[model samples]
Target: SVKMKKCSREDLQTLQQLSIETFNDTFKEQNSPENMKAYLESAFNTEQLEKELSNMSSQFFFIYFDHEIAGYVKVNIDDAQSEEMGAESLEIERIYIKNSFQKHGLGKHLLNKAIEIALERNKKNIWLGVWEKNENAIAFYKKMGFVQTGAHSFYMGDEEQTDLIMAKTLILE
Candidate 1:
């Protein structure tokens, strides 16, 4: 079974640790070691994560598998979203499960939780960005009823990359 708890200031170190590991676990091979190091600091450092944790419009959650830390999710609404998605939209900014926990349905569980929160806040849509080359995750998101709506460019180290935007409209009923 899996359980989720909202992140707090006290969980900053744990969140930072998980963020770095899961990110490195997923993209280490696709990117340069230098880029990985830079991104790890820019995106997952305690200071950055603590500021994110403090964002009123953003929320983080830790998933537990039988009392062990298994994965985490970062969700944003309003101005906290990475894109100009508007106030009616919610963003699933990050969702990374440890390599050991990949086969389970934990990602789906966390995703559903994000959707639940979006509906609770009366959001009209939920969206996320996935690397263009991560075919597995793109397919998974599509199977979950998301449609690609756009694409955005970002830089990691000296390389440029594209992220395909995927979204799903929420039916309040």
Candidate 2:
């Protein structure tokens, strides 16, 4: 059975390992080796994941598919930092699934959890960003009912990459 729950401190290293493995798999095609090196270094550094999980600055959640950690998500309510990120609404800092778990509706399950939390919290909307070059992720987001609201660009290494800010409204019931 698959279970989704709040991540605990004990889950950190496993999440870190998942992060390193899956992030490399997801971005390898769009990013060069140098970019992957820098990106993964900053994105999955133990200290960063620890802070996000321990301080609860970001609410981290994970899915255990058939009793094994399969993926995780990090979210945070709107704040000054949220507004600065151009999100005047709930923000999804990260959402990832292990490579072997793709195309299994697990992403949809996690995304629906996000929607439920946002609506329950009275969040006006839910938002996330996808790398402009990652067509697979964009397609998945489309199926989840997200549409592009804006765009941002930055240098990942020697190359520039653009990202699309996508959002979906959450009606509180």
Candidate 3:
């Protein structure tokens, strides 16, 4: 079984390295070197990561497969959510698996964890944003029962990118 452990300050370096590695592996091919470098530098900087790790409304978990760190998931609630999805919702900010672990369902495992957390917290829905150009991820999210609810602009260095906001309602109204 895959194991997940909550990240703490002591795990900052590991998290930082894994975050950059997975992100670059996943998107570097589709973005400019300058943009990728800029985003990685700013986003994974020690100061920024430390702040996020200490946030009250956010949580990060590392998934282990056979004792190896294979992926991670980030979940946010209330004000921690990137967008104002209201207090009734939880945000699946990121679900990334290392390239070699891609086909092993690690991403889906993380998604399931997110769903479990949302339900445990009594959230009415769960949501996330994926780059519009990431067709595989978009398809995966749709297959997991999410529907496009909106779109948001994301900045990659100085470039403007569009991300499709998708959501899965847990407690239907």
Best by lDDT: 3
66-173 in candidate 3: lDDT tens per residue? Answer: 999999999999999988889999999988999888878888888999999999889999999999999989998998899999997888556789999999889655
How high is the lDDT of residue 100 in model 3? 84
RMSD of 2: 2.3
Q: What lDDT tens digits, residue by residue, belong to model 1 across residues 1-173?
A: 68999999999999999998988988988888988888888898778888999999999999999999999999999999998889999999999888898869988888899999999999999999999988978988898899999997887567889989999999756
Q: Per lDDT, what order, best first?
A: 3, 1, 2
Per-residue lDDT for 1-173 in model 2, tens only? 88999888888888888888877887787667987888788978889788777664467788888998888877787552244543336777678888788788888888888787777777788888788988888999999899999998876667778988899877745
Which pairs of residues have clashing backbones in candidate 3? none
TM-scores for all predictions: 0.95, 0.88, 0.93
* lDDT values, one for every candidate: 0.91, 0.79, 0.92
Residue 89 of model 2 has an lDDT of 62
Clashes of each: 0, 0, 0
Best-to-worst ranking by TM-score: 1, 3, 2
